[PDB]
């Protein structure tokens, strides 16, 4: 309670045993069956002895009420969770959902009053850019009747039902945290509903079906139905997805028809949705032998799933294949990847720990046979890559190593002459690398960084109290009390004596193999479709610290040698030419296949390079002697008494003696060990290999040289032939070390591969445009229900939808509608008890106040976080200037009154200091516009970092830090000319910026906030201030949109830049005192630019008017858009401080004196060395839908009179215009297109001051002593230039 | 000259004696570590892919229900004329033998290529 | 003085005879550990002393 | 007598050549070796 | 005839230089096998700890 709220969205797995435990302490009959009956036996044993507490009571009474209601319905039957989805995805009740229905009807009225003016604003914006005749007729009716289309969906009444149930359940939890009365069933027309703290009972009156749900199930149902509602509305309203809609709705029927009969295995079919789509994409391959390679495996898997579950008929399988052929077959390439957006539209399966334990136990206890020559050839290639990297970064000199006596003459002469090695020389002379021994040439710099420990990871309990995680209610005995801490940063920040070299000696000394308190546990992942479930591991403090230190030592050192030959991003975009094909596979179970013998030689070589005895062999030697178990609170062990972990059976939840690896924990080591075998198969196949890992996928690009006079299909078929030969050789070589490449699961293709931004198809991007639309959901994941963060999330999701190909104007309209509905939910349907009538009743009775609050931009005091210039380009320069331009566009189209502009300029200023201005240079000093969560995290992180006795934080954090930050900000900014951005950069690169970075990387979450609240880190005044912040910002908006002050200097049809200057002068008038503010304002993108479309003999009207400042775009005719064509960090910070100070505040001896005094705190340099070392004073369209036109266009800027920001955003806006013109057309038809984008910046000018030698008025206090901590200070910077 | 040859033979005897100590040390290590068609591996080999079986390298029609569905999906996803696609589905319903399915698959590939 | 090398050459012959016994013992150990591969005749070794050999090899 | 010693030296040359072949075939069997890994750690 | 033995003695030296490289190959194979497989050292101290130690560590 208090400042904390119950969670809004699902962030935890669904466990059957929780539901079973609630229904057994409630004594309600149910139809669940457990694979392990241990929990029910423990419940029966506890109830036989008469055990009770405060939690068993208040579910007996709820169960009594459920039984008394079920006496009224004689033929009742309980339906389990996977079998009731079709009943619960389509559920409605009129009487239970009256209040939210009235609120959304009011929201429909508020949007309908201004829909036509929103359309006129968008139409004027479209007509300004030159597309005045290209606006479709359906766009007007879809913008005006948006709420009618939203209320007409099939998911609207289930959305109302699940939103009502979720809100009442969160209210019950928030009220019961403070604490009572017995729950009472509420009788509707169709259902009867009981909502309790932990159980929700729904009885259908007609079918007499009974459903029991927990809190997590309610959250999951609300998320699924709201996502379906949003994406169905978006598909119905946009024309581009219309036929796509006709498939997706069918899918939404078909899988739901499988849920009453199949049950929990249905998600396995849902788990086939991500392979099958790619398989259907493989049906469009130019190599006709590769058409049905993956589809055969997918259909065999679907037939096996139907056969094992008792549904073994030929007709059912044939009808399912016909249904999938209807869903997945399409002709548009860009809509093949939209089914990817609908993976989480069916919910998540229920999980048990024993099934995942068996899945891990099957692979981690398997004998293997490994041949020696393949391992030694991979070791030789690995050594060759290390030698070539050291020659590359030390001028052709070999690393310190001793070749054996039996080495070949080629390797000996290569060492003597300092020559490199190819892969062929390493494979042919692998016996010369059998007895090599490296030297130490990699430093261990662990004192310079702190980022590895401040990442929050959970810790397992101690071994002797390994039963401390299970509650007493679910055990047949009394578990031991848990005394160990639960978080990494809690142990790390309270460590009075911490040394990373002692953490290294924990492994090197060998005490890690014999310590008594080492433990490791598994936990189920939150939101996945796999029915067995996936696990993540937690272990104790010291071994986790050793793991992160080892990963960082691999990352900062030898791993940079191996990053050069591979490519981190986009596969480097894949007479003779180079032709390539792709192999994609998954790496889910590859960690379980690793052994000590495979990784041992590579770990010895890394031990010799890093000079650490027996360090990198730590994982297998620790795990082969330790017992693993899967820890869930409702899944107890089958033990009648407390025993240690070495006495438990190898059954149920326990894995006794694993031989294998954990997911993660050696990722860079396994990658660096993986690449030599890829190069070995490349050498045996005679091809070239590029590699890329992405998510859970491995992608290998096979490249061969081909004559350029050949046709395209012959080149592609030759590439596919050498690719499948490489696949056979690679499969044999990976089986030689025992990793099971599994050719059934692997996709071999010539066009597409899967990466982060979508699917790459021969230079085309297939994106998931509707995936972010399903995340446009009321409220956000914050500890306090905040309206502004929710509106910012809505704007971010709609903008991310626009970047993947969705229509701009419909996304803007959906943003306005969702902001209106979010404001009405935040005022009228909330669990916040601080919502008093003094702000609720004036807002809810005044409609125009709500509409003007929804439409006003957020940088000037409103709630709209989506600017119109954001609809076309990612980067808007000045938020205030863009907000004023947007407001003037709303006034011009009669969307907003003119007086609101006056109400912007006569707004009451806030109270902020120079430090707040330097932290946020573009802020306009508004009232109560910050976030509660960010402020609470900053206060909590600062409190813990001051009160940490850790020796690494020796002198960075102290009680007088904030006074020092305020003094530095007042020194930088209180001058005769105020430059906020230069002060922001200098403050960011200083000690204050380092402290803010260290506090920012520390994620407090809920646990550290509760810890600081119990310890008294947060006083009661901060709690009462942040508990009423939403109420105060609604009051601030209400006062802003009410005041009657007017000035005659304010006028429309004036420059937005000058209005921004006037607003920044007025709102910052206490600190500035009339002094000028420089460097923040830029021209608006949409205001300064006008577009025109020109044919051959057509003349441009803007050029006839006399404007000659324009950019020129050309699109040729007859091109198919769908079809395929044819030093230290502190030293760098000190240099940055010196160059920004010298460039901003002038160049003189006093200026360099102050610059040296500021830069001396980061590095130990003199004034002369600092003066010497400092310097003295093709658009990127990939990754978006903008590529689809931009591969054919030509851009010239010869008529642009050269300011730079305008020069890139003009080309970006021109590409956006050309994308919007050809959005619904398959082909640029029969005529060339010329786009003129004219810039009108005769206004928007600033009197330039250049470098006017701005002096300092204050005195620079600095500090009594310099902090010599290696985190921020460089004692020996040396010279590099 | 023969006295000069005698000293070289003396140097050989020291080098032979140094080698036999070295082999004896490796004899001690290799005897403890290492310890004739006695036994066989119980199917720890990878299964080699044949021309009959389908894999990632290519699709070959075989066995029962899945291959017919894959061939029908190749007919549906192709760019052929709809009457020709219906006639090919009729011939696919006529075809029952596995070698006849392979012959039909090759013929369909030749139609799609041309 | 040249006829004094008779005992030196015989001293060499005992060293090579000692070497030939050590090679024959090494050839005996590597011939014992060979298994057939379903007649490749490749040797196989284990972790502690052939502990996986009961798990992997076929029971005769 | 020195001519009698030449027959013994050539006997050494044949004997070294026989040991070098048996060492070479010893390397061939050792280079083609395989490693068996157990399923579980013992303790 | 006795001066013809100098070519034979030099031929012995080439055979010995061929022999000890082949022994060094056997040393390289035995070193790689016995360290990648745990427990075959028979306590000589751990061969994985046969690295040199000065990576600016020096805690002891
Ligand atoms: C021997 N060989 N050959 C091949 C190939 F087939 F490509 F040739 C591949 C391999 C091999 O083993 N790859 C490999 C390499 C690394 C890992 S991983 O487990 O560490 N990692 C990547 C995969 C998915 C899991 C992820 C862990 C990430 N965590 C930590 C961070 O947050 C999210 C979860 C797993 C497998």
JSON list of N, CA, C and O in Angstrom, two decimals, chain A residues 372 376 405-406 430 434 439-440 444 501 505 596-597 600-601 604 607-608 610-611 613-614, chain E residues 20-21 24-25 28-29 32-33 35-38 48-57 59:
[
{"chain": "A", "resi": 372, "resn": "UNK", "atom": "N", "xyz": [39.51, -36.84, -31.69]},
{"chain": "A", "resi": 372, "resn": "UNK", "atom": "CA", "xyz": [40.57, -35.94, -31.24]},
{"chain": "A", "resi": 372, "resn": "UNK", "atom": "C", "xyz": [41.05, -34.99, -32.33]},
{"chain": "A", "resi": 372, "resn": "UNK", "atom": "O", "xyz": [41.41, -33.84, -32.03]},
{"chain": "A", "resi": 376, "resn": "UNK", "atom": "N", "xyz": [41.54, -30.87, -32.30]},
{"chain": "A", "resi": 376, "resn": "UNK", "atom": "CA", "xyz": [42.86, -30.27, -32.46]},
{"chain": "A", "resi": 376, "resn": "UNK", "atom": "C", "xyz": [42.92, -29.32, -33.66]},
{"chain": "A", "resi": 376, "resn": "UNK", "atom": "O", "xyz": [43.64, -28.32, -33.60]},
{"chain": "A", "resi": 405, "resn": "UNK", "atom": "N", "xyz": [59.32, -28.57, -30.30]},
{"chain": "A", "resi": 405, "resn": "UNK", "atom": "CA", "xyz": [60.43, -28.99, -31.15]},
{"chain": "A", "resi": 405, "resn": "UNK", "atom": "C", "xyz": [59.94, -29.60, -32.46]},
{"chain": "A", "resi": 405, "resn": "UNK", "atom": "O", "xyz": [60.61, -29.49, -33.49]},
{"chain": "A", "resi": 406, "resn": "UNK", "atom": "N", "xyz": [58.76, -30.21, -32.44]},
{"chain": "A", "resi": 406, "resn": "UNK", "atom": "CA", "xyz": [58.23, -30.91, -33.61]},
{"chain": "A", "resi": 406, "resn": "UNK", "atom": "C", "xyz": [57.43, -30.00, -34.53]},
{"chain": "A", "resi": 406, "resn": "UNK", "atom": "O", "xyz": [56.69, -30.51, -35.38]},
{"chain": "A", "resi": 430, "resn": "UNK", "atom": "N", "xyz": [48.37, -28.81, -37.98]},
{"chain": "A", "resi": 430, "resn": "UNK", "atom": "CA", "xyz": [47.75, -28.77, -36.66]},
{"chain": "A", "resi": 430, "resn": "UNK", "atom": "C", "xyz": [48.61, -29.45, -35.60]},
{"chain": "A", "resi": 430, "resn": "UNK", "atom": "O", "xyz": [48.58, -29.04, -34.43]},
{"chain": "A", "resi": 434, "resn": "UNK", "atom": "N", "xyz": [50.27, -28.64, -31.19]},
{"chain": "A", "resi": 434, "resn": "UNK", "atom": "CA", "xyz": [49.86, -29.56, -30.14]},
{"chain": "A", "resi": 434, "resn": "UNK", "atom": "C", "xyz": [50.44, -29.18, -28.79]},
{"chain": "A", "resi": 434, "resn": "UNK", "atom": "O", "xyz": [49.76, -29.27, -27.76]},
{"chain": "A", "resi": 439, "resn": "UNK", "atom": "N", "xyz": [52.12, -16.77, -23.71]},
{"chain": "A", "resi": 439, "resn": "UNK", "atom": "CA", "xyz": [52.58, -15.91, -22.63]},
{"chain": "A", "resi": 439, "resn": "UNK", "atom": "C", "xyz": [51.47, -14.97, -22.19]},
{"chain": "A", "resi": 439, "resn": "UNK", "atom": "O", "xyz": [50.40, -14.88, -22.80]},
{"chain": "A", "resi": 440, "resn": "UNK", "atom": "N", "xyz": [51.75, -14.25, -21.11]},
{"chain": "A", "resi": 440, "resn": "UNK", "atom": "CA", "xyz": [50.78, -13.31, -20.55]},
{"chain": "A", "resi": 440, "resn": "UNK", "atom": "C", "xyz": [50.95, -11.95, -21.24]},
{"chain": "A", "resi": 440, "resn": "UNK", "atom": "O", "xyz": [52.00, -11.32, -21.11]},
{"chain": "A", "resi": 444, "resn": "UNK", "atom": "N", "xyz": [44.52, -7.28, -16.56]},
{"chain": "A", "resi": 444, "resn": "UNK", "atom": "CA", "xyz": [43.26, -7.47, -15.84]},
{"chain": "A", "resi": 444, "resn": "UNK", "atom": "C", "xyz": [42.91, -6.14, -15.19]},
{"chain": "A", "resi": 444, "resn": "UNK", "atom": "O", "xyz": [43.32, -5.85, -14.06]},
{"chain": "A", "resi": 501, "resn": "UNK", "atom": "N", "xyz": [40.45, -8.92, -7.09]},
{"chain": "A", "resi": 501, "resn": "UNK", "atom": "CA", "xyz": [41.51, -9.92, -7.15]},
{"chain": "A", "resi": 501, "resn": "UNK", "atom": "C", "xyz": [41.29, -11.02, -6.13]},
{"chain": "A", "resi": 501, "resn": "UNK", "atom": "O", "xyz": [41.68, -12.17, -6.36]},
{"chain": "A", "resi": 505, "resn": "UNK", "atom": "N", "xyz": [40.99, -14.94, -6.84]},
{"chain": "A", "resi": 505, "resn": "UNK", "atom": "CA", "xyz": [41.64, -15.95, -6.02]},
{"chain": "A", "resi": 505, "resn": "UNK", "atom": "C", "xyz": [40.67, -16.92, -5.37]},
{"chain": "A", "resi": 505, "resn": "UNK", "atom": "O", "xyz": [41.10, -17.97, -4.89]},
{"chain": "A", "resi": 596, "resn": "UNK", "atom": "N", "xyz": [33.40, -30.62, -20.60]},
{"chain": "A", "resi": 596, "resn": "UNK", "atom": "CA", "xyz": [34.70, -30.16, -20.14]},
{"chain": "A", "resi": 596, "resn": "UNK", "atom": "C", "xyz": [35.78, -30.42, -21.19]},
{"chain": "A", "resi": 596, "resn": "UNK", "atom": "O", "xyz": [36.67, -29.59, -21.39]},
{"chain": "A", "resi": 597, "resn": "UNK", "atom": "N", "xyz": [35.70, -31.57, -21.86]},
{"chain": "A", "resi": 597, "resn": "UNK", "atom": "CA", "xyz": [36.73, -31.97, -22.81]},
{"chain": "A", "resi": 597, "resn": "UNK", "atom": "C", "xyz": [36.74, -31.10, -24.06]},
{"chain": "A", "resi": 597, "resn": "UNK", "atom": "O", "xyz": [37.80, -30.88, -24.65]},
{"chain": "A", "resi": 600, "resn": "UNK", "atom": "N", "xyz": [38.06, -27.47, -22.86]},
{"chain": "A", "resi": 600, "resn": "UNK", "atom": "CA", "xyz": [39.23, -27.50, -21.98]},
{"chain": "A", "resi": 600, "resn": "UNK", "atom": "C", "xyz": [40.46, -26.88, -22.62]},
{"chain": "A", "resi": 600, "resn": "UNK", "atom": "O", "xyz": [41.15, -26.08, -21.99]},
{"chain": "A", "resi": 601, "resn": "UNK", "atom": "N", "xyz": [40.76, -27.22, -23.89]},
{"chain": "A", "resi": 601, "resn": "UNK", "atom": "CA", "xyz": [41.96, -26.70, -24.55]},
{"chain": "A", "resi": 601, "resn": "UNK", "atom": "C", "xyz": [41.87, -25.20, -24.79]},
{"chain": "A", "resi": 601, "resn": "UNK", "atom": "O", "xyz": [42.86, -24.47, -24.62]},
{"chain": "A", "resi": 604, "resn": "UNK", "atom": "N", "xyz": [42.49, -23.57, -21.53]},
{"chain": "A", "resi": 604, "resn": "UNK", "atom": "CA", "xyz": [43.93, -23.55, -21.23]},
{"chain": "A", "resi": 604, "resn": "UNK", "atom": "C", "xyz": [44.64, -22.43, -21.98]},
{"chain": "A", "resi": 604, "resn": "UNK", "atom": "O", "xyz": [45.53, -21.78, -21.43]},
{"chain": "A", "resi": 607, "resn": "UNK", "atom": "N", "xyz": [43.78, -19.31, -20.30]},
{"chain": "A", "resi": 607, "resn": "UNK", "atom": "CA", "xyz": [44.51, -19.26, -19.05]},
{"chain": "A", "resi": 607, "resn": "UNK", "atom": "C", "xyz": [45.95, -18.81, -19.26]},
{"chain": "A", "resi": 607, "resn": "UNK", "atom": "O", "xyz": [46.50, -18.05, -18.46]},
{"chain": "A", "resi": 608, "resn": "UNK", "atom": "N", "xyz": [46.59, -19.28, -20.33]},
{"chain": "A", "resi": 608, "resn": "UNK", "atom": "CA", "xyz": [47.96, -18.87, -20.62]},
{"chain": "A", "resi": 608, "resn": "UNK", "atom": "C", "xyz": [48.03, -17.42, -21.08]},
{"chain": "A", "resi": 608, "resn": "UNK", "atom": "O", "xyz": [48.99, -16.71, -20.77]},
{"chain": "A", "resi": 610, "resn": "UNK", "atom": "N", "xyz": [45.75, -14.94, -20.29]},
{"chain": "A", "resi": 610, "resn": "UNK", "atom": "CA", "xyz": [45.39, -14.06, -19.19]},
{"chain": "A", "resi": 610, "resn": "UNK", "atom": "C", "xyz": [46.21, -14.30, -17.93]},
{"chain": "A", "resi": 610, "resn": "UNK", "atom": "O", "xyz": [46.06, -13.55, -16.96]},
{"chain": "A", "resi": 611, "resn": "UNK", "atom": "N", "xyz": [47.06, -15.33, -17.91]},
{"chain": "A", "resi": 611, "resn": "UNK", "atom": "CA", "xyz": [47.92, -15.59, -16.76]},
{"chain": "A", "resi": 611, "resn": "UNK", "atom": "C", "xyz": [47.18, -16.00, -15.51]},
{"chain": "A", "resi": 611, "resn": "UNK", "atom": "O", "xyz": [47.60, -15.63, -14.41]},
{"chain": "A", "resi": 613, "resn": "UNK", "atom": "N", "xyz": [45.74, -19.28, -13.32]},
{"chain": "A", "resi": 613, "resn": "UNK", "atom": "CA", "xyz": [45.78, -20.75, -13.23]},
{"chain": "A", "resi": 613, "resn": "UNK", "atom": "C", "xyz": [44.40, -21.33, -12.98]},
{"chain": "A", "resi": 613, "resn": "UNK", "atom": "O", "xyz": [43.76, -21.01, -11.97]},
{"chain": "A", "resi": 614, "resn": "UNK", "atom": "N", "xyz": [43.96, -22.20, -13.90]},
{"chain": "A", "resi": 614, "resn": "UNK", "atom": "CA", "xyz": [42.73, -23.00, -13.79]},
{"chain": "A", "resi": 614, "resn": "UNK", "atom": "C", "xyz": [41.48, -22.14, -13.62]},
{"chain": "A", "resi": 614, "resn": "UNK", "atom": "O", "xyz": [40.56, -22.50, -12.87]},
{"chain": "E", "resi": 20, "resn": "UNK", "atom": "N", "xyz": [63.92, -37.80, -32.76]},
{"chain": "E", "resi": 20, "resn": "UNK", "atom": "CA", "xyz": [63.52, -36.99, -31.61]},
{"chain": "E", "resi": 20, "resn": "UNK", "atom": "C", "xyz": [62.42, -35.98, -31.93]},
{"chain": "E", "resi": 20, "resn": "UNK", "atom": "O", "xyz": [61.74, -35.52, -31.02]},
{"chain": "E", "resi": 21, "resn": "UNK", "atom": "N", "xyz": [62.26, -35.61, -33.21]},
{"chain": "E", "resi": 21, "resn": "UNK", "atom": "CA", "xyz": [61.10, -34.82, -33.61]},
{"chain": "E", "resi": 21, "resn": "UNK", "atom": "C", "xyz": [59.83, -35.66, -33.51]},
{"chain": "E", "resi": 21, "resn": "UNK", "atom": "O", "xyz": [58.78, -35.18, -33.08]},
{"chain": "E", "resi": 24, "resn": "UNK", "atom": "N", "xyz": [59.02, -35.84, -30.02]},
{"chain": "E", "resi": 24, "resn": "UNK", "atom": "CA", "xyz": [58.44, -34.56, -29.64]},
{"chain": "E", "resi": 24, "resn": "UNK", "atom": "C", "xyz": [57.00, -34.43, -30.12]},
{"chain": "E", "resi": 24, "resn": "UNK", "atom": "O", "xyz": [56.19, -33.73, -29.50]},
{"chain": "E", "resi": 25, "resn": "UNK", "atom": "N", "xyz": [56.67, -35.07, -31.24]},
{"chain": "E", "resi": 25, "resn": "UNK", "atom": "CA", "xyz": [55.28, -35.14, -31.68]},
{"chain": "E", "resi": 25, "resn": "UNK", "atom": "C", "xyz": [54.45, -35.96, -30.70]},
{"chain": "E", "resi": 25, "resn": "UNK", "atom": "O", "xyz": [53.32, -35.60, -30.36]},
{"chain": "E", "resi": 28, "resn": "UNK", "atom": "N", "xyz": [53.79, -33.87, -27.74]},
{"chain": "E", "resi": 28, "resn": "UNK", "atom": "CA", "xyz": [52.72, -32.91, -27.99]},
{"chain": "E", "resi": 28, "resn": "UNK", "atom": "C", "xyz": [51.34, -33.54, -27.94]},
{"chain": "E", "resi": 28, "resn": "UNK", "atom": "O", "xyz": [50.38, -32.91, -27.48]},
{"chain": "E", "resi": 29, "resn": "UNK", "atom": "N", "xyz": [51.22, -34.78, -28.41]},
{"chain": "E", "resi": 29, "resn": "UNK", "atom": "CA", "xyz": [49.94, -35.48, -28.34]},
{"chain": "E", "resi": 29, "resn": "UNK", "atom": "C", "xyz": [49.59, -35.87, -26.91]},
{"chain": "E", "resi": 29, "resn": "UNK", "atom": "O", "xyz": [48.44, -35.76, -26.49]},
{"chain": "E", "resi": 32, "resn": "UNK", "atom": "N", "xyz": [48.50, -32.77, -24.90]},
{"chain": "E", "resi": 32, "resn": "UNK", "atom": "CA", "xyz": [47.17, -32.28, -25.24]},
{"chain": "E", "resi": 32, "resn": "UNK", "atom": "C", "xyz": [46.08, -33.21, -24.73]},
{"chain": "E", "resi": 32, "resn": "UNK", "atom": "O", "xyz": [45.00, -32.75, -24.34]},
{"chain": "E", "resi": 33, "resn": "UNK", "atom": "N", "xyz": [46.33, -34.52, -24.73]},
{"chain": "E", "resi": 33, "resn": "UNK", "atom": "CA", "xyz": [45.33, -35.48, -24.25]},
{"chain": "E", "resi": 33, "resn": "UNK", "atom": "C", "xyz": [45.18, -35.40, -22.74]},
{"chain": "E", "resi": 33, "resn": "UNK", "atom": "O", "xyz": [44.06, -35.32, -22.21]},
{"chain": "E", "resi": 35, "resn": "UNK", "atom": "N", "xyz": [45.71, -33.15, -20.49]},
{"chain": "E", "resi": 35, "resn": "UNK", "atom": "CA", "xyz": [45.26, -31.94, -19.82]},
{"chain": "E", "resi": 35, "resn": "UNK", "atom": "C", "xyz": [43.81, -31.63, -20.16]},
{"chain": "E", "resi": 35, "resn": "UNK", "atom": "O", "xyz": [43.07, -31.15, -19.29]},
{"chain": "E", "resi": 36, "resn": "UNK", "atom": "N", "xyz": [43.36, -31.95, -21.38]},
{"chain": "E", "resi": 36, "resn": "UNK", "atom": "CA", "xyz": [41.96, -31.75, -21.74]},
{"chain": "E", "resi": 36, "resn": "UNK", "atom": "C", "xyz": [41.04, -32.74, -21.03]},
{"chain": "E", "resi": 36, "resn": "UNK", "atom": "O", "xyz": [39.85, -32.47, -20.86]},
{"chain": "E", "resi": 37, "resn": "UNK", "atom": "N", "xyz": [41.57, -33.88, -20.62]},
{"chain": "E", "resi": 37, "resn": "UNK", "atom": "CA", "xyz": [40.82, -34.89, -19.87]},
{"chain": "E", "resi": 37, "resn": "UNK", "atom": "C", "xyz": [41.21, -34.77, -18.40]},
{"chain": "E", "resi": 37, "resn": "UNK", "atom": "O", "xyz": [42.40, -34.84, -18.09]},
{"chain": "E", "resi": 38, "resn": "UNK", "atom": "N", "xyz": [40.26, -34.57, -17.49]},
{"chain": "E", "resi": 38, "resn": "UNK", "atom": "CA", "xyz": [40.61, -34.38, -16.08]},
{"chain": "E", "resi": 38, "resn": "UNK", "atom": "C", "xyz": [41.06, -35.67, -15.42]},
{"chain": "E", "resi": 38, "resn": "UNK", "atom": "O", "xyz": [40.62, -36.76, -15.78]},
{"chain": "E", "resi": 48, "resn": "UNK", "atom": "N", "xyz": [46.85, -27.52, -15.70]},
{"chain": "E", "resi": 48, "resn": "UNK", "atom": "CA", "xyz": [46.14, -26.29, -16.04]},
{"chain": "E", "resi": 48, "resn": "UNK", "atom": "C", "xyz": [46.64, -25.09, -15.25]},
{"chain": "E", "resi": 48, "resn": "UNK", "atom": "O", "xyz": [46.45, -23.95, -15.68]},
{"chain": "E", "resi": 49, "resn": "UNK", "atom": "N", "xyz": [47.29, -25.33, -14.10]},
{"chain": "E", "resi": 49, "resn": "UNK", "atom": "CA", "xyz": [47.96, -24.29, -13.34]},
{"chain": "E", "resi": 49, "resn": "UNK", "atom": "C", "xyz": [49.43, -24.13, -13.73]},
{"chain": "E", "resi": 49, "resn": "UNK", "atom": "O", "xyz": [50.20, -23.56, -12.96]},
{"chain": "E", "resi": 50, "resn": "UNK", "atom": "N", "xyz": [49.83, -24.62, -14.91]},
{"chain": "E", "resi": 50, "resn": "UNK", "atom": "CA", "xyz": [51.19, -24.44, -15.40]},
{"chain": "E", "resi": 50, "resn": "UNK", "atom": "C", "xyz": [51.37, -23.16, -16.19]},
{"chain": "E", "resi": 50, "resn": "UNK", "atom": "O", "xyz": [52.28, -23.07, -17.03]},
{"chain": "E", "resi": 51, "resn": "UNK", "atom": "N", "xyz": [50.53, -22.15, -15.96]},
{"chain": "E", "resi": 51, "resn": "UNK", "atom": "CA", "xyz": [50.67, -20.86, -16.61]},
{"chain": "E", "resi": 51, "resn": "UNK", "atom": "C", "xyz": [51.70, -20.04, -15.85]},
{"chain": "E", "resi": 51, "resn": "UNK", "atom": "O", "xyz": [52.10, -20.41, -14.74]},
{"chain": "E", "resi": 52, "resn": "UNK", "atom": "N", "xyz": [52.14, -18.93, -16.43]},
{"chain": "E", "resi": 52, "resn": "UNK", "atom": "CA", "xyz": [52.94, -17.95, -15.71]},
{"chain": "E", "resi": 52, "resn": "UNK", "atom": "C", "xyz": [51.99, -16.94, -15.07]},
{"chain": "E", "resi": 52, "resn": "UNK", "atom": "O", "xyz": [50.88, -16.71, -15.56]},
{"chain": "E", "resi": 53, "resn": "UNK", "atom": "N", "xyz": [52.41, -16.38, -13.94]},
{"chain": "E", "resi": 53, "resn": "UNK", "atom": "CA", "xyz": [51.50, -15.52, -13.17]},
{"chain": "E", "resi": 53, "resn": "UNK", "atom": "C", "xyz": [52.14, -14.15, -12.97]},
{"chain": "E", "resi": 53, "resn": "UNK", "atom": "O", "xyz": [52.97, -13.97, -12.07]},
{"chain": "E", "resi": 54, "resn": "UNK", "atom": "N", "xyz": [51.80, -13.20, -13.85]},
{"chain": "E", "resi": 54, "resn": "UNK", "atom": "CA", "xyz": [51.94, -11.78, -13.56]},
{"chain": "E", "resi": 54, "resn": "UNK", "atom": "C", "xyz": [50.94, -10.98, -14.40]},
{"chain": "E", "resi": 54, "resn": "UNK", "atom": "O", "xyz": [51.37, -10.19, -15.26]},
{"chain": "E", "resi": 55, "resn": "UNK", "atom": "N", "xyz": [49.61, -11.16, -14.25]},
{"chain": "E", "resi": 55, "resn": "UNK", "atom": "CA", "xyz": [48.70, -10.25, -14.95]},
{"chain": "E", "resi": 55, "resn": "UNK", "atom": "C", "xyz": [48.26, -9.09, -14.08]},
{"chain": "E", "resi": 55, "resn": "UNK", "atom": "O", "xyz": [47.07, -8.79, -14.01]},
{"chain": "E", "resi": 56, "resn": "UNK", "atom": "N", "xyz": [49.24, -8.42, -13.45]},
{"chain": "E", "resi": 56, "resn": "UNK", "atom": "CA", "xyz": [49.03, -7.38, -12.44]},
{"chain": "E", "resi": 56, "resn": "UNK", "atom": "C", "xyz": [48.09, -7.85, -11.33]},
{"chain": "E", "resi": 56, "resn": "UNK", "atom": "O", "xyz": [47.22, -7.11, -10.86]},
{"chain": "E", "resi": 57, "resn": "UNK", "atom": "N", "xyz": [48.26, -9.10, -10.90]},
{"chain": "E", "resi": 57, "resn": "UNK", "atom": "CA", "xyz": [47.34, -9.67, -9.93]},
{"chain": "E", "resi": 57, "resn": "UNK", "atom": "C", "xyz": [47.87, -9.49, -8.51]},
{"chain": "E", "resi": 57, "resn": "UNK", "atom": "O", "xyz": [47.30, -8.72, -7.73]},
{"chain": "E", "resi": 59, "resn": "UNK", "atom": "N", "xyz": [47.91, -10.77, -5.31]},
{"chain": "E", "resi": 59, "resn": "UNK", "atom": "CA", "xyz": [47.25, -10.54, -4.01]},
{"chain": "E", "resi": 59, "resn": "UNK", "atom": "C", "xyz": [48.02, -11.13, -2.85]},
{"chain": "E", "resi": 59, "resn": "UNK", "atom": "O", "xyz": [48.01, -10.57, -1.75]}
]
